[PDB]
Design an enzyme around this catalytic site. Structure first.
Site, PDB file in Angstrom:
ATOM      1  N   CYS E  97       0.861  -1.196   0.000  1.00  0.00           N
ATOM      2  CA  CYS E  97       0.000   0.000   0.000  1.00  0.00           C
ATOM      3  C   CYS E  97       0.890   1.236   0.000  1.00  0.00           C
ATOM      4  O   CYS E  97       1.646   1.454   0.937  1.00  0.00           O
ATOM      5  CB  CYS E  97      -0.942   0.043   1.221  1.00  0.00           C
ATOM      6  N   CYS E 147      18.455 -41.428  23.093  1.00  0.00           N
ATOM      7  CA  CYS E 147      19.014 -40.260  22.443  1.00  0.00           C
ATOM      8  C   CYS E 147      19.342 -40.491  20.963  1.00  0.00           C
ATOM      9  O   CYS E 147      19.296 -39.557  20.171  1.00  0.00           O
ATOM     10  CB  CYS E 147      20.254 -39.790  23.185  1.00  0.00           C
ATOM     11  N   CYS E 186       2.522 -43.883  10.566  1.00  0.00           N
ATOM     12  CA  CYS E 186       1.450 -43.390  11.456  1.00  0.00           C
ATOM     13  C   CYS E 186       2.017 -42.784  12.769  1.00  0.00           C
ATOM     14  O   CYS E 186       1.550 -41.751  13.255  1.00  0.00           O
ATOM     15  CB  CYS E 186       0.455 -44.501  11.796  1.00  0.00           C
ATOM     16  N   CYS E 257      11.851 -45.164  -7.332  1.00  0.00           N
ATOM     17  CA  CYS E 257      10.734 -45.155  -6.392  1.00  0.00           C
ATOM     18  C   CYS E 257      10.245 -43.724  -6.228  1.00  0.00           C
ATOM     19  O   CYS E 257      11.060 -42.801  -6.159  1.00  0.00           O
ATOM     20  CB  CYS E 257      11.133 -45.719  -5.019  1.00  0.00           C
ATOM     21  N   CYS E 259       8.456 -42.568  -3.563  1.00  0.00           N
ATOM     22  CA  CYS E 259       8.084 -42.210  -2.190  1.00  0.00           C
ATOM     23  C   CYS E 259       8.813 -40.986  -1.725  1.00  0.00           C
ATOM     24  O   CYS E 259       9.735 -40.528  -2.400  1.00  0.00           O
ATOM     25  CB  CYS E 259       8.300 -43.328  -1.203  1.00  0.00           C
ATOM     26  N   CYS E 325      44.661 -49.684 -25.021  1.00  0.00           N
ATOM     27  CA  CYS E 325      46.069 -50.092 -25.206  1.00  0.00           C
ATOM     28  C   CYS E 325      46.321 -51.612 -25.148  1.00  0.00           C
ATOM     29  O   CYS E 325      47.457 -52.044 -25.271  1.00  0.00           O
ATOM     30  CB  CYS E 325      47.000 -49.329 -24.250  1.00  0.00           C
ATOM     31  N   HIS E 411      26.524 -40.146  24.182  1.00  0.00           N
ATOM     32  CA  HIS E 411      25.297 -39.382  24.153  1.00  0.00           C
ATOM     33  C   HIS E 411      25.148 -38.594  22.861  1.00  0.00           C
ATOM     34  O   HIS E 411      26.102 -37.948  22.392  1.00  0.00           O
ATOM     35  CB  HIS E 411      25.275 -38.414  25.336  1.00  0.00           C
TER      36      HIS E 411
HETATM   37 ZN   LIG Z   1      45.094 -48.133 -21.799  1.00  0.00          ZN
HETATM   38 ZN   LIG Z   2       0.366 -45.660   8.655  1.00  0.00          ZN
HETATM   39 ZN   LIG Z   3      -2.914   1.412   3.380  1.00  0.00          ZN
HETATM   40 ZN   LIG Z   4      10.863 -45.344  -1.790  1.00  0.00          ZN
END
Ligand SMILES: [Zn+2]
Ligand SMILES: [Zn+2]
Ligand SMILES: [Zn+2]
Ligand SMILES: [Zn+2]
Ligand SMILES: [Zn+2]
Ligand SMILES: [Zn+2]
Ligand SMILES: [Zn+2]
Ligand SMILES: [Zn+2]
Lengths: 86, 91, 93, 76, 455
Positions: E97, E147, E186, E257, E259, E325, E411
């Site tokens: 604006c 972890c 899921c 694939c 996916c 060669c 860890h």
């Molecule tokens: Zn060669």
């Molecule tokens: Zn599922």
């Molecule tokens: Zn304005």
């Molecule tokens: Zn896949």
């Protein structure tokens, strides 16, 4: 470093007040043109990436875009909201 | 006349070289961290000025962001522009 | 009427490119922040601790093994730090 | 057929194998060359760790394919 | 008390005026996404008054076809002179604006204008993200030795491709099992639900993680969280499970694939075998990858480790007969990248095997960049005015997993970058803010890089 005089005549030959053009002149072509990225070059993507690669340009440009279902609380991409059922 | 600048730019775009310049500049600035520094600078100015008004925020960010461009990036990109310009202007 | 040179025009091309990019970046920042501030009037920053101890809500690490989990498989409360051990003895049969 | 293994140092070694050779067998050959026991080896191809009891052909490993050898870094 | 542009509010009091605006916004943005670069420069970034390209931002008029620059105040003059106060920035699609001298960024309808036809339904069915959940930040409590699982899951949950997949309901819509206690995908969707939304209706936000642990136990008890394990092995395990659930959900000579794993993480190596005399050849083998494992000994920088990966080797135990060669030679082998992934995952080989049959961790610091250019590792060059050149191909670092301890005990922690550049440290239940300067000092084990710029 030195002073420029003009533009070479051969460039003008094949290249070259208020404008009369319209940004909307691009719609016709745009309808027929595959999705383009600002800074992921189409030809280089064909050469260096897989043809079925998923691509998100600037994925961290802004925070994740979504809304939350009032009924079940699921986070939904904006393109998934209309079809979403319980 | 000042039609020259617009003329030269049109040639750069039609030739493909505007893209090369624009793309290489963006890549350099991204890799050296300038893009993200400018984002941080912008957030800081918004906090200092308690404002998200684009015009007033830009007025403080832009000059500073221009100064932040590395000497390396400025001279490398200028060198490239000048090579493409020395192609199609008589001096 | 200032003199025009490859150096001057080139500087102008670079200035055009840089100010556009800056303006793009800034517009993205200001619009995002305008949205967050409108969306979240009480918006607070994630907590930052120079000492490396407090979380993003300004809280310390909770005492485990103080927490428990209610195992949906057998109905017993299990110490949270032993759930994996419990599941080895609970999910089998 | 010959296949390759890019070892822990990045040095590539060569194995003589059949498409039907089992992963155990392959790991035994790597041990003969590199001195790492099979139960310490993780052998990666095409994003998967190769599992004992399976064959090279199960993973579409072909002539001059390269397998990537790593160890395990355990953490809790 | 943040305000909204009253000039657009005024327009929006009329339904057909509102629809006209949104229709034009949708059209301009469609053009910007469906125009090749030269066309975009010449027709959306060219000032109608001074005819300069990129005279600052160029604005596309909302009410007419004019484009006007910022630097010479040329759109500002169009607004004063024709009375058109609204223009769209051709670099980003944002609506300005020129009376407020500000962008209109806080009207949800405009921001998601592609849904204008369905807006009424979108607001009744849905709400904006809760403040506390908007970035999906939440800790995953240590459930034993978990972890190595949670560090990986945080990187998945903060991966923009996985994020988009899960929230687009792709798995939910097609899953044939539909139980988070059996199906890994899921369980993952449940974690996403919990972290960004709200499950109907202290241990908070662990339900999805417990489901995941339950799925894992059933498939591979060693990787299910009781014992210490390798984060890389868990990463590969989980992405294989996502792939396996895709294949199960198929209703059905088609080699790639489709996916989410195989369209995001998969690239290909080119392995060349060349005669050291003729140096011409070569016998090239293409091997898929979902990640790259890099050697680190005697090196200090990630680019050095990639250089090492890509270095030519002369093989001494390979039987090779050159056809140019006609003789036995010790062949030269080289690995390069044939195809890159959208998300490049790197594992640093932080271990060595000793003569006593023990292994030892390599704790050496390896510097890694915020942006990674892969151009030097790509096998095939493009034409360039002589051998050719590969263009810049730059990735953005978004995730790191680090290990502290020894080879057999330690860890794991994760660090993830989200929009705006803030990094967070995920240490089991504790999520904390960390500076980039400090993240960059971490001992990286896994690195996650997303594609950002391809020239
Ligand atoms: Zn060669
Ligand atoms: Zn599922
Ligand atoms: Zn304005
Ligand atoms: Zn896949
Ligand atoms: Zn719902
Ligand atoms: Zn139980
Ligand atoms: Zn202008
Ligand atoms: Zn107008």
């Amino acid at each position: 470093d030195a002073e420029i005089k003009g533009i070479k005549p051969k460039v003008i030959e094949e290249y070259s007040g208020p404008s009369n053009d319209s940004w909307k002149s691009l719609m016709s072509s745009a309808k027929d043109t595959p999705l383009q990225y600002d800074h992921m070059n189409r030809e280089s993507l064909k050469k260096y990436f897989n043809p079925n690669a998923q691509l998100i340009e600037d994925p961290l440009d802004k925070p994740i875009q979504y809304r939350v279902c009032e009924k079940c609380g699921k986070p939904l991409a904006l393109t998934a909201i209309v079809d979403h059922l319980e | 006349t000042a039609q020259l600048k617009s003329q030269i730019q049109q040639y750069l775009v039609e030739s493909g070289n505007y893209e090369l310049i624009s793309n290489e500049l963006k890549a350099r600035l991204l890799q050296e961290g300038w893009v993200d520094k400018v984002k941080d600078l912008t957030k800081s100015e918004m906090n200092i000025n308690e404002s998200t008004n684009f015009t007033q925020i830009l007025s403080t960010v832009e000059p500073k962001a221009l100064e932040m461009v590395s000497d390396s990036t400025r001279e490398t990109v200028l060198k490239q522009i000048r090579e493409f310009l020395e192609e199609i202007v008589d001096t | 009427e200032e003199t025009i040179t490859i150096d001057s025009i080139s500087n102008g091309i670079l200035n055009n490119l840089l100010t556009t990019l800056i303006q793009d970046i800034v517009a993205r920042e200001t619009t995002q922040q305008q949205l967050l501030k409108t969306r979240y009037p009480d918006l607070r920053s994630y907590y930052f601790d120079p000492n490396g101890s407090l979380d993003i809500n300004g809280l310390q690490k909770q005492q485990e093994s103080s927490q428990y989990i209610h195992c949906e498989n057998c109905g017993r409360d299990v110490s949270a730090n032993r759930l994996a051990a419990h599941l080895q003895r609970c999910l089998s049969r | 057929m010959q296949i390759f293994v890019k070892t822990l140092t990045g040095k590539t070694i060569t194995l003589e194998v059949e498409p039907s050779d089992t992963i155990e067998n392959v790991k035994a050959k790597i041990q003969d060359k590199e001195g790492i026991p099979p139960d310490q080896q993780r052998l990666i191809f095409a994003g998967k760790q190769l599992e004992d009891g399976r064959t090279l052909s199960d993973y579409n490993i072909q002539k001059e394919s390269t397998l990537h050898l790593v160890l395990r870094l355990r953490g809790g | 008390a943040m305000s909204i542009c009253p000039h657009i509010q005024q327009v929006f009091q009329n339904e057909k005026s509102k629809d006209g605006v949104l229709k034009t916004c949708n059209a301009a943005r469609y053009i910007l996404n469906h125009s090749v670069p030269k066309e975009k420069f010449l027709n959306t970034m060219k000032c109608g008054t001074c005819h300069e390209i990129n005279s600052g931002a160029t604005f596309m008029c909302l009410q007419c076809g004019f484009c006007g620059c910022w630097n010479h105040s040329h759109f500002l003059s169009h607004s004063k002179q024709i009375g058109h106060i609204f223009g769209i920035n051709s670099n980003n699609g944002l609506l300005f604006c020129f009376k407020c001298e500000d962008y209109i960024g806080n009207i949800d309808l405009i921001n998601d204008a592609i849904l204008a036809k369905y807006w009424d339904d979108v607001c009744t069915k849905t709400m904006v993200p809760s403040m506390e959940r908007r970035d999906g930040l939440s800790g995953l409590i240590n459930m034993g030795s978990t972890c190595f699982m949670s560090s990986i899951l945080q990187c998945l949950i903060h991966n923009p491709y996985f994020i988009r997949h899960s929230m687009s309901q792709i798995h939910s819509n097609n899953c044939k099992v539909r139980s988070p206690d059996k199906c890994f995908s899921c369980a993952l969707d449940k974690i996403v639900h919990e972290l960004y939304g709200a499950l109907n209706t202290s241990t908070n936000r662990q339900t999805g993680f417990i489901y995941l642990l339950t799925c894992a136990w059933k498939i591979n008890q060693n990787l299910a969280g009781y014992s210490q394990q390798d984060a890389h092995e868990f990463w590969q395990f989980i992405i294989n499970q996502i792939h396996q659930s895709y294949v199960l959900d198929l209703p059905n000579n088609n080699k790639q694939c489709e996916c989410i794993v195989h369209t995001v993480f998969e690239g290909s190596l080119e392995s060349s075998i060349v005669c050291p005399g003729c140096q011409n050849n070569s016998k090239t083998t293409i091997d898929p990858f979902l990640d790259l494992s890099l050697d680190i000994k005697d090196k200090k920088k990630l680019y050095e480790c990639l250089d090492s990966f890509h270095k030519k080797e002369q093989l001494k135990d390979f039987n090779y007969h050159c056809g140019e060669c006609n003789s036995t030679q010790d062949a030269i082998k080289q690995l390069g990248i044939h195809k890159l992934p959208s998300v490049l995952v790197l594992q640093l080989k932080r271990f060595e095997h000793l003569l006593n049959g023990s292994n030892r961790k390599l704790d050496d610091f390896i510097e890694f960049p915020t942006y990674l250019n892969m151009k030097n590792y790509c096998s095939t060059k493009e034409k360039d005015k002589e051998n050719g050149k590969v263009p810049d191909i730059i990735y953005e670092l978004i995730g790191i997993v680090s290990h502290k301890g020894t080879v057999n005990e330690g860890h794991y922690i994760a660090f993830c970058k989200i929009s705006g550049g803030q990094w967070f440290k995920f240490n089991d239940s504790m999520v904390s803010s960390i500076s980039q300067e400090e993240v960059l000092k971490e001992q990286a084990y896994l690195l996650f890089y997303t594609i950002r710029q391809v020239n």
